[PDB]
């Protein structure tokens, strides 16, 4: 009559949202947590893609290459609002167009 | 300066304690509410090749319903093997005897 002690294993998956500030300074983009992770300082030359989500108006992503790095870092964000999303993506798309013209 | 939220997908395994008991052709998994299986409902029971304490049991309620997949962790690789063996023996005697 041995009953065995066992654990059922259940995959959980969820999406955490961590507050940042995103600042655009000329061709630099600074992605800054308030006060533990480090601030990210990107140059427009590093951005390979920047896109407002088609499903969720408030979502956008910025993909980034760096010089000694194999992979693309893929940074997904949610803006405070659909309108702030479109502003941030447009401003970055225009900086990237301008930079790439050269 | 815009206020934005970095979205980060996080994934992990939640482990829920149960007891597993076998009585004749029935399997009881209890901590939720008690779950009872007949051996005819079991499609497959397999020990992990990577993690010796892990096993899984696949189940079909009725007829040709979609298979449901349950994953479990035992106290030890020995006890995982013992559970897997006992349930395989039962399923085999059911299919053949």
Reported structure resolution in angstroms: 1.9
Residue A82, C-beta contacts closer than 8 angstroms, at least 6 positions apart: A57, A58
HSE-CB of B78 using CA atoms within 13 angstroms: 0
What CA–CA distance (Å, rounded) separates A49 from A64? 7
Domain membership flag for residue B3:
no
What would the 3-class secondary structure string for chain A be? Answer: CCCEEEEEEEEEEEEEEEEEEEEEECCEEEEECCCCCCCEEEEHHHEEEEEECCCCCCEEEEEECCCCCCCCEEEEEEECCHHHHHHHHHHHHHHHHHHHHC
C-beta atoms of A79 and B19 within 8 A = no
| CATH code of the domain containing B80 | 2.30.29.30
| H or E, element range at B61 | none
The answer to whether residue B30 is domain-embedded is yes
Interatomic CA distance for residues B97 and B91, integer angstroms: 10
Give chain A's domain count.
Answer: 1
Q: Hey, what long-range contacts does A42-47 have (CB within 8 A, 24 or more apart)? A: A44/A92, A44/A95, A44/A96, A44/A99, A45/A99, A47/A92, A47/A96
What stretch of H or E contains B4?
A: strand B2-23
Cα→Cα distances B29→A27, A38, A71, Å: 60, 46, 45
Give CA–CA dist A59/A66, Å, rounded.
Answer: 23
B5 domain residue, yes or no = no
Residue B2 inside a domain? The answer is: no
Q: Judge whether B60 lies within some domain.
A: yes
Q: How far is CA B71 from CA A13, B45, B88, in A?
A: 16, 10, 16
Position A63 in a domain: yes
Cβ–Cβ of A9/B14 closer than 8 Å? yes
Please indicate the experimental technique that yielded this structure.
Answer: X-ray
Put simply, the chain A residues between 5 and 34 with a CB less than 8 A from any chain B CB are 5-23, 31
CA–CA gap between residue B3 and residue A80 (Å, rounded): 6
The answer to whether the CB atoms of A79 and B4 lie below 8 A apart is yes
Neighbouring residues of A76: CB distance < 8 A, sequence distance ≥ 6? A59, A60, A61, B6, B7, B8
Which of B51, B50, B69 lies closest to B60 in space, CA to CA?
Answer: B69
Tell me if A71 is assigned to some domain. Answer: yes
**Does residue A10 form part of some domain?**
no
Q: Which two tokens stand for residue A51?
A: 């896109």
- Residue ranges making up the domain that contains A101: 20-102
């Amino acid at each position: 009559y041995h009953k065995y002690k066992v654990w059922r294993r259940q995959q959980m998956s969820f999406i955490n949202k961590h507050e940042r500030t995103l600042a655009i300074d000329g061709d630099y983009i600074y992605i800054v947590p308030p006060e533990n992770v480090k601030t990210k300082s990107l140059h427009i030359s590093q951005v390979v893609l920047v896109k407002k989500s088609k499903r969720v108006p408030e979502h956008f992503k910025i993909f980034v290459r760096r010089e000694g790095q194999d992979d693309i870092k893929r940074y997904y964000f949610e803006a405070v609002s659909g309108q702030e999303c479109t502003e941030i993506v447009t401003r970055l798309q225009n900086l990237l167009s301008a930079y790439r013209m050269n």
